[PDB]
Amino acid sequence: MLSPKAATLAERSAGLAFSLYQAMAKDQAVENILLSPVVVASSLGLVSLGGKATTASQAKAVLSAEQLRDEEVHAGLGELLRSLSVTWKLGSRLYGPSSVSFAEDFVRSSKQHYNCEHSKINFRDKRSALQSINEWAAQTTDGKLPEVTKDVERTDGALLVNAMFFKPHWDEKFHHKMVDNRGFMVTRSYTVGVTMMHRTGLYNYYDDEKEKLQIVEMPLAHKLSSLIILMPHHVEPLERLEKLLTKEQLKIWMGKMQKKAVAISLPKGVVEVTHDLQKHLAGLGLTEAIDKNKADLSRMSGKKDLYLASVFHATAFEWDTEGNPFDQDIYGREELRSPKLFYADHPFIFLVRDTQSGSLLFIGRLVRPKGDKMRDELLE
Amino acid sequence: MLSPKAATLAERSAGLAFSLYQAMAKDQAVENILLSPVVVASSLGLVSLGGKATTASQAKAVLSAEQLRDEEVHAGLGELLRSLSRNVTWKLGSRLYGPSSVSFAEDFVRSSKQHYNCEHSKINFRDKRSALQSINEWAAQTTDGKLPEVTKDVERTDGALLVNAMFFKPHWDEKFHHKMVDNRGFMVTRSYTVGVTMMHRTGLYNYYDDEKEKLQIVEMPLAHKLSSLIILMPHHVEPLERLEKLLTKEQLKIWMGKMQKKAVAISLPKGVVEVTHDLQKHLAGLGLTEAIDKNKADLSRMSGKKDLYLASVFHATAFEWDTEGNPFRSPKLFYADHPFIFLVRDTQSGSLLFIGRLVRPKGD
């Protein structure tokens, strides 16, 4: 059960999630998005824990925890991380150059609050360094996330790596055989072959005919959390819908939702996304920590030359049929007669929200699933 | 399995089907087309049987069986008709209607029944309503009411009428689910939509999509894979003219060799299509000019009357599209909501059972 300080930081992490999601969604180089608000917040905590003066205060400001004291930030984020331990695997490792030795007090605190691991790596042996990072991520996620990055640009600073595996476990499972091959429309001119999973059930649903979008709430195991999916009616870039996506608009949409018979079709499989949050966090106010000249990470090691080179947020999010069983007489009940369609064969936004606290576990978007390009025979 | 003589006549009936289909498709008055090549061939065979000199030889020439002997032609088409008589519903009737005054020759009656299962009837065309009632009742009984009417009017009342009444219902090798039926709009033209009932099914079918010629071709096997229904359709709504220019015996062979078994989501109009053609003017255009003209006609073997001529060749068909059949990768769509061409081919011989087109289904 969440303490008042952890409950406060859950608010600040969710606020930062919307902030970070929006910044990344504006970046044209970004396709799929997968963000864990608590994990993103924890990274700033580590900067606030390992940094001094302006480097540390900027991290607190990005988190919007200016009024909060260092103690409640670290203990509160630590409590939040522990609360999430639906199958979920998380690993945090700080990689520094072979020359540097991390401060004993920092090692104690980062392991205590953030379960942060510490590793000295020789970036000069590029292949070996990448192999070490990728093997660590692979073991953390039991092979679900076998690779973080194919290249490390900044080789003179600290790398923070977060390796994650998340698999939503439905409150009402999909039938294991209700799986087939469909075409996913990345654009109206680009189709990718995907595996789709299907289910007709009673779900909280809303169709905005004015804003031309659909919103469905999929409860997770034991109704402790829910997966919310936002999708336009037509195949279009998510930009328009992302302009509408605010904490207040989400509250409006959710109050308009009603339990209806919905026929859901979702892509099935693992979505692997690696983000380097470095430039994005800098854009949000973490400028000093990422610049070699201005960085003050003296609490982390004892050397001013040490800076934050990267913040890797690597996630393997699995869409599968597995969930809790349900009574089969549900279908004999005409409640499920003429369902609404939630046919996710084009880009959508999704959120994983704790039903009780309202805390955001995940925020993301599926723009381009893994699969081969098809030819829409009927396309003109 | 077909004898070498029936096999040769099967080639010529199918060749004639393409020739006749093309002639009728050029006629702007013609909407839907429904032709049974063997039945059309048999009609010419009857003209050769009941006719002498140029009347008979023209019939043989239209059939392209000039090289063959009269007997070989009659026996081979007769074998063909019989061979196409398994788990698919098919009803066929052939009746020769002559004026009340005329009496058919006993030997002709024997031979036309033997080879062509042709019935003979004397009718008084002066009592128009009674004459039409007799023809329509005969066609209805033949098709068990599926084809209740042949024609609303008989123009030429002084000659012989050949009436072919048919009912054909393809029985699928893999049935459609009885509940997978709904109402859709059929695009007759880009500006004209008619409300139809559609039946749907996703399955493994021989399919080919010509990206260049902007058309799709699907093969739907019939009960026990003894025959197949082939559907040819442009990607979008357009007049069939462009596609009909491509439709040759050789091009169909090319397309069929290019087909591959793929997952296909089929949507077809469901119901009975009733088509009555008077092949008289079309067979005349193909070379049967003498049998069709009262002055030149020689049907002396048929009765003993020179005045006797071929007034009409009614090819009346009721073709039913239904869900019924035998129990059973990202699919391609074969969404038949616009005009298409279809063929029914015996998988073994290659012989064409049917050639047609659905341009305007019944509906509002």
Binding site: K177, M178 | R184, G185, H200
Partner: peptide
């Protein structure tokens, strides 16, 4: 066992 996949959706609107 689950039922068959449903019918193909209706044709899209003109451009």
């Amino acid at each position: 066992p689950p039922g068959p996949p449903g019918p193909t959706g209706p044709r899209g609107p003109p451009g």
